[PDB]
Amino acid sequence: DVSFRLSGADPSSYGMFIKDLRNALPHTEKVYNIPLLLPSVSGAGRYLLMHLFNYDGNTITVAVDVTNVYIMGYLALTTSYFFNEPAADLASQYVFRSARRKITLPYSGNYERLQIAAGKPREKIPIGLPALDTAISTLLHYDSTAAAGALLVLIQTTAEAARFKYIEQQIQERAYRDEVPSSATISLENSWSGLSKQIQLAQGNNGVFRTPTVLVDSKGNRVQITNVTSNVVTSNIQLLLNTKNI
Numbered sequence: 001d002v003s004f005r006l007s008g009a010d011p012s013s014y015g016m017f018i019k020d021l022r023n024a025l026p027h028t029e030k031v032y033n034i035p036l037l038l039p040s041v042s043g044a045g046r047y048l049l050m051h052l053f054n055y056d057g058n059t060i061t062v063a064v065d066v067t068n069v070y071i072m073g074y075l076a077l078t079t080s081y082f083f084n085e086p087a088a089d090l091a092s093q094y095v096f097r098s099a100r101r102k103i104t105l106p107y108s109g110n111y112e113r114l115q116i117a118a119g120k121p122r123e124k125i126p127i128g129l130p131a132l133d134t135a136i137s138t139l140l141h142y143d144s145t146a147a148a149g150a151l152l153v154l155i156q157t158t159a160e161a162a163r164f165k166y167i168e169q170q171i172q173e174r175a176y177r178d179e180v181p182s183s184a185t186i187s188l189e190n191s192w193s194g195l196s197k198q199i200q201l202a203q204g205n206n207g208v209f210r211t212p213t214v215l216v217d218s219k220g221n222r223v224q225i226t227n228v229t230s231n232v233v234t235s236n237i238q239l240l241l242n243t244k245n246i
Protein backbone atom coordinates (compact mmCIF):
# COMPACT_ATOMS: atom_id res chain seq x y z
CA ASP A 1 0.00 0.00 0.00
CA VAL A 2 0.99 3.63 -0.17
CA SER A 3 0.10 6.44 2.24
CA PHE A 4 0.03 10.26 2.04
CA ARG A 5 -0.75 12.66 4.85
CA LEU A 6 -1.89 16.19 4.34
CA SER A 7 -0.93 17.16 7.85
CA GLY A 8 2.63 18.54 7.70
CA ALA A 9 2.71 17.88 3.92
CA ASP A 10 5.02 19.86 1.79
CA PRO A 11 6.44 19.59 -1.76
CA SER A 12 8.95 17.02 -0.55
CA SER A 13 6.57 14.54 1.30
CA TYR A 14 4.20 14.88 -1.63
CA GLY A 15 7.08 14.02 -4.03
CA MET A 16 7.83 10.95 -1.85
CA PHE A 17 4.18 9.86 -2.02
CA ILE A 18 4.07 10.08 -5.82
CA LYS A 19 7.41 8.31 -6.01
CA ASP A 20 5.93 5.56 -3.77
CA LEU A 21 2.76 5.50 -5.90
CA ARG A 22 4.86 4.99 -9.07
CA ASN A 23 7.03 2.35 -7.43
CA ALA A 24 3.97 0.43 -6.28
CA LEU A 25 2.85 -0.22 -9.87
CA PRO A 26 4.40 -3.49 -11.09
CA HIS A 27 6.22 -3.74 -14.41
CA THR A 28 8.48 -6.45 -15.92
CA GLU A 29 9.67 -4.13 -18.77
CA LYS A 30 10.82 -0.52 -19.41
CA VAL A 31 10.18 0.88 -22.80
CA TYR A 32 12.64 3.70 -23.52
CA ASN A 33 13.51 3.62 -19.81
CA ILE A 34 9.89 4.18 -18.69
CA PRO A 35 8.14 1.51 -16.62
CA LEU A 36 5.66 -0.36 -18.86
CA LEU A 37 2.43 -1.18 -17.06
CA LEU A 38 1.36 -4.86 -17.13
CA PRO A 39 -1.38 -5.98 -19.55
CA SER A 40 -3.34 -7.57 -16.66
CA VAL A 41 -3.15 -8.73 -13.08
CA SER A 42 -5.80 -11.25 -11.91
CA GLY A 43 -7.65 -11.09 -8.62
CA ALA A 44 -6.89 -8.88 -5.72
CA GLY A 45 -3.26 -8.06 -6.69
CA ARG A 46 -4.60 -5.84 -9.44
CA TYR A 47 -5.51 -3.12 -6.94
CA LEU A 48 -3.23 -0.76 -5.13
CA LEU A 49 -4.56 0.71 -1.88
CA MET A 50 -3.67 4.38 -1.23
CA HIS A 51 -4.26 5.53 2.29
CA LEU A 52 -4.96 9.25 2.20
CA PHE A 53 -5.20 11.36 5.30
CA ASN A 54 -6.69 14.78 5.46
CA TYR A 55 -5.19 17.45 7.60
CA ASP A 56 -7.34 16.34 10.54
CA GLY A 57 -6.08 12.80 10.21
CA ASN A 58 -9.37 11.49 8.77
CA THR A 59 -8.69 8.97 6.09
CA ILE A 60 -9.94 7.24 2.99
CA THR A 61 -8.43 4.25 1.19
CA VAL A 62 -8.50 4.56 -2.61
CA ALA A 63 -8.28 1.50 -4.80
CA VAL A 64 -6.21 1.92 -7.91
CA ASP A 65 -6.02 -0.60 -10.79
CA VAL A 66 -2.18 -1.12 -11.03
CA THR A 67 -2.38 -1.75 -14.79
CA ASN A 68 -3.76 1.71 -15.72
CA VAL A 69 -3.56 3.86 -12.59
CA TYR A 70 -7.34 4.07 -12.71
CA ILE A 71 -9.08 4.85 -9.48
CA MET A 72 -11.90 2.30 -9.11
CA GLY A 73 -13.42 3.48 -5.75
CA TYR A 74 -12.50 4.19 -2.15
CA LEU A 75 -13.45 3.31 1.38
CA ALA A 76 -14.43 5.94 3.84
CA LEU A 77 -15.00 4.62 7.33
CA THR A 78 -17.37 1.67 6.91
CA THR A 79 -18.75 2.63 3.48
CA SER A 80 -17.25 1.73 0.17
CA TYR A 81 -17.87 3.73 -2.93
CA PHE A 82 -17.21 2.53 -6.48
CA PHE A 83 -17.66 4.15 -9.87
CA ASN A 84 -20.60 3.03 -11.94
CA GLU A 85 -18.56 1.01 -14.46
CA PRO A 86 -17.75 -2.71 -15.03
CA ALA A 87 -14.09 -2.41 -14.08
CA ALA A 88 -15.09 -0.78 -10.75
CA ASP A 89 -17.84 -3.29 -10.23
CA LEU A 90 -15.21 -6.00 -10.85
CA ALA A 91 -12.92 -4.20 -8.37
CA SER A 92 -15.61 -4.32 -5.66
CA GLN A 93 -15.27 -8.10 -5.66
CA TYR A 94 -11.75 -7.66 -4.30
CA VAL A 95 -11.35 -4.52 -2.24
CA PHE A 96 -13.17 -3.11 0.81
CA ARG A 97 -15.36 -6.24 1.26
CA SER A 98 -15.20 -5.59 4.98
CA ALA A 99 -17.30 -2.33 4.42
CA ARG A 100 -20.70 -2.29 6.09
CA ARG A 101 -22.35 -1.09 2.87
CA LYS A 102 -21.36 -0.30 -0.64
CA ILE A 103 -22.58 2.63 -2.67
CA THR A 104 -22.10 2.76 -6.39
CA LEU A 105 -21.56 6.34 -7.42
CA PRO A 106 -24.01 7.70 -9.99
CA TYR A 107 -21.26 8.05 -12.64
CA SER A 108 -18.32 6.30 -14.17
CA GLY A 109 -14.84 7.36 -13.50
CA ASN A 110 -14.09 9.04 -16.76
CA TYR A 111 -13.38 12.74 -16.95
CA GLU A 112 -16.42 13.53 -19.08
CA ARG A 113 -18.93 11.82 -16.75
CA LEU A 114 -17.20 13.32 -13.61
CA GLN A 115 -17.33 16.86 -15.13
CA ILE A 116 -21.04 16.59 -16.08
CA ALA A 117 -21.68 15.32 -12.56
CA ALA A 118 -19.59 18.08 -10.99
CA GLY A 119 -21.19 20.82 -13.17
CA LYS A 120 -17.69 22.19 -14.05
CA PRO A 121 -14.92 21.18 -16.48
CA ARG A 122 -11.75 20.36 -14.71
CA GLU A 123 -10.25 23.48 -16.40
CA LYS A 124 -12.25 25.44 -13.89
CA ILE A 125 -11.44 23.34 -10.78
CA PRO A 126 -8.50 24.43 -8.66
CA ILE A 127 -6.11 21.61 -7.67
CA GLY A 128 -3.16 21.43 -5.29
CA LEU A 129 -2.51 20.03 -1.77
CA PRO A 130 -5.10 22.16 0.04
CA ALA A 131 -7.61 20.93 -2.61
CA LEU A 132 -6.63 17.25 -2.17
CA ASP A 133 -7.23 17.89 1.58
CA THR A 134 -10.77 19.21 0.78
CA ALA A 135 -11.34 16.25 -1.57
CA ILE A 136 -10.42 13.66 1.00
CA SER A 137 -12.76 15.49 3.45
CA THR A 138 -15.66 15.55 1.01
CA LEU A 139 -15.32 11.88 0.18
CA LEU A 140 -15.66 10.99 3.87
CA HIS A 141 -19.42 11.68 3.72
CA TYR A 142 -21.45 10.68 0.72
CA ASP A 143 -22.59 13.54 -1.52
CA SER A 144 -22.49 12.47 -5.13
CA THR A 145 -22.34 15.97 -6.71
CA ALA A 146 -19.62 17.22 -4.37
CA ALA A 147 -17.75 13.90 -4.64
CA ALA A 148 -17.53 14.24 -8.46
CA GLY A 149 -15.50 17.48 -7.93
CA ALA A 150 -13.53 15.84 -5.15
CA LEU A 151 -12.78 12.88 -7.47
CA LEU A 152 -11.56 15.11 -10.29
CA VAL A 153 -9.24 16.77 -7.80
CA LEU A 154 -8.18 13.37 -6.41
CA ILE A 155 -7.55 11.78 -9.85
CA GLN A 156 -5.33 14.66 -10.86
CA THR A 157 -3.36 14.90 -7.71
CA THR A 158 -2.46 11.19 -7.36
CA ALA A 159 -2.87 9.22 -10.67
CA GLU A 160 -2.15 11.93 -13.18
CA ALA A 161 0.83 13.16 -11.05
CA ALA A 162 2.19 9.55 -10.94
CA ARG A 163 1.87 9.42 -14.75
CA PHE A 164 3.63 12.71 -15.49
CA LYS A 165 6.45 14.43 -13.72
CA TYR A 166 5.18 17.76 -15.05
CA ILE A 167 1.81 17.27 -13.26
CA GLU A 168 3.56 16.16 -10.05
CA GLN A 169 5.52 19.44 -10.26
CA GLN A 170 2.29 21.44 -10.94
CA ILE A 171 0.89 20.10 -7.65
CA GLN A 172 4.11 20.68 -5.78
CA GLU A 173 3.84 24.30 -6.89
CA ARG A 174 0.26 24.23 -5.49
CA ALA A 175 1.33 22.92 -2.12
CA TYR A 176 -0.18 25.78 -0.17
CA ARG A 177 -2.31 27.45 -2.82
CA ASP A 178 -4.66 25.70 -5.26
CA GLU A 179 -4.78 26.71 -8.79
CA VAL A 180 -6.66 25.42 -11.74
CA PRO A 181 -4.42 23.08 -13.80
CA SER A 182 -2.49 24.60 -16.77
CA SER A 183 -3.75 23.75 -20.25
CA ALA A 184 -0.51 21.73 -20.61
CA THR A 185 -1.68 19.61 -17.60
CA ILE A 186 -5.08 19.06 -19.28
CA SER A 187 -3.31 18.20 -22.54
CA LEU A 188 -1.12 15.57 -20.73
CA GLU A 189 -4.02 13.95 -18.90
CA ASN A 190 -5.94 13.63 -22.13
CA SER A 191 -2.87 12.36 -24.06
CA TRP A 192 -1.68 9.62 -21.78
CA SER A 193 -3.12 6.63 -23.65
CA GLY A 194 -2.04 8.24 -26.88
CA LEU A 195 1.55 8.80 -25.71
CA SER A 196 1.70 5.45 -24.04
CA LYS A 197 0.75 3.87 -27.35
CA GLN A 198 3.17 5.89 -29.57
CA ILE A 199 6.07 5.31 -27.14
CA GLN A 200 5.47 1.59 -27.49
CA LEU A 201 5.00 1.71 -31.30
CA ALA A 202 8.25 3.72 -31.49
CA GLN A 203 10.11 0.48 -30.43
CA GLY A 204 10.27 -1.08 -33.79
CA ASN A 205 9.96 2.17 -35.63
CA ASN A 206 13.37 3.61 -34.62
CA GLY A 207 11.98 5.80 -31.78
CA VAL A 208 9.57 7.44 -34.29
CA PHE A 209 5.80 7.79 -33.49
CA ARG A 210 3.46 6.02 -35.95
CA THR A 211 1.07 9.07 -35.32
CA PRO A 212 2.17 12.33 -33.78
CA THR A 213 0.73 13.40 -30.39
CA VAL A 214 -0.55 17.00 -30.24
CA LEU A 215 0.04 18.59 -26.89
CA VAL A 216 -0.19 22.06 -25.42
CA ASP A 217 3.12 23.30 -23.87
CA SER A 218 3.84 25.39 -20.70
CA LYS A 219 3.82 28.73 -22.56
CA GLY A 220 0.34 27.82 -23.99
CA ASN A 221 0.56 26.82 -27.73
CA ARG A 222 0.16 23.46 -29.54
CA VAL A 223 3.24 21.31 -30.04
CA GLN A 224 3.54 18.18 -32.02
CA ILE A 225 5.35 15.21 -30.44
CA THR A 226 6.78 12.83 -33.07
CA ASN A 227 9.56 10.70 -31.49
CA VAL A 228 11.09 9.56 -28.18
CA THR A 229 13.79 12.36 -28.07
CA SER A 230 11.00 14.73 -27.09
CA ASN A 231 11.13 16.01 -23.52
CA VAL A 232 7.69 14.64 -22.74
CA VAL A 233 9.19 11.19 -23.41
CA THR A 234 12.71 11.65 -21.96
CA SER A 235 11.76 13.59 -18.84
CA ASN A 236 7.99 13.88 -18.30
CA ILE A 237 5.87 10.66 -18.67
CA GLN A 238 6.68 8.10 -15.87
CA LEU A 239 4.35 5.19 -16.63
CA LEU A 240 3.14 3.65 -19.89
CA LEU A 241 -0.28 2.25 -20.40
CA ASN A 242 0.29 -1.11 -22.08
CA THR A 243 -1.03 -1.15 -25.71
CA LYS A 244 -2.85 -4.38 -24.78
CA ASN A 245 -5.20 -2.04 -22.82
CA ILE A 246 -5.63 0.64 -25.60
Ligand SMILES: *[C@@H]1O[C@H](CO)[C@@H](O[C@@H]2O[C@H](CO)[C@@H](O)[C@H](O)[C@H]2NC(C)=O)[C@H](O)[C@H]1NC(C)=O
Binds near residue numbers: 226
Ligand atom coordinates in the same frame (compact mmCIF):
# COMPACT_ATOMS: atom_id res chain seq x y z
C1 LIG B 1 12.69 14.09 -32.55
O1 LIG B 1 12.04 15.10 -31.82
C2 LIG B 1 12.71 16.36 -31.79
C3 LIG B 1 11.79 17.29 -31.03
O2 LIG B 1 11.70 16.84 -29.71
C4 LIG B 1 12.97 16.94 -33.18
O3 LIG B 1 13.79 18.10 -33.15
C5 LIG B 1 12.98 19.31 -33.16
O4 LIG B 1 12.17 19.63 -34.31
C6 LIG B 1 12.55 20.74 -35.15
C7 LIG B 1 13.87 20.51 -35.95
O5 LIG B 1 13.84 19.40 -36.86
C8 LIG B 1 12.49 22.04 -34.30
O6 LIG B 1 11.22 22.65 -34.46
C9 LIG B 1 12.71 21.77 -32.80
O7 LIG B 1 13.19 22.92 -32.13
C10 LIG B 1 13.67 20.58 -32.59
N1 LIG B 1 14.14 20.52 -31.20
C11 LIG B 1 15.30 20.00 -30.78
C12 LIG B 1 15.54 20.09 -29.29
O8 LIG B 1 16.14 19.45 -31.49
C13 LIG B 1 13.67 15.94 -34.08
O9 LIG B 1 13.69 16.51 -35.39
C14 LIG B 1 12.99 14.55 -33.98
N2 LIG B 1 13.78 13.49 -34.62
C15 LIG B 1 13.21 12.58 -35.44
C16 LIG B 1 14.17 11.56 -36.00
O10 LIG B 1 11.99 12.53 -35.73
Ligand SMILES: C[C@H]1O[C@H](O)[C@H](O)[C@@H](O)[C@H]1O
Binds near residue numbers: 111
Ligand atom coordinates in the same frame (compact mmCIF):
# COMPACT_ATOMS: atom_id res chain seq x y z
C1 LIG C 1 -10.06 9.56 -16.72
C2 LIG C 1 -9.26 8.65 -15.78
O1 LIG C 1 -8.19 9.39 -15.20
C3 LIG C 1 -7.37 8.47 -14.48
O2 LIG C 1 -7.01 7.38 -15.33
C4 LIG C 1 -8.14 7.93 -13.27
O3 LIG C 1 -7.31 7.03 -12.54
C5 LIG C 1 -9.39 7.19 -13.77
O4 LIG C 1 -10.20 6.80 -12.65
C6 LIG C 1 -10.19 8.13 -14.68
O5 LIG C 1 -10.70 9.22 -13.91
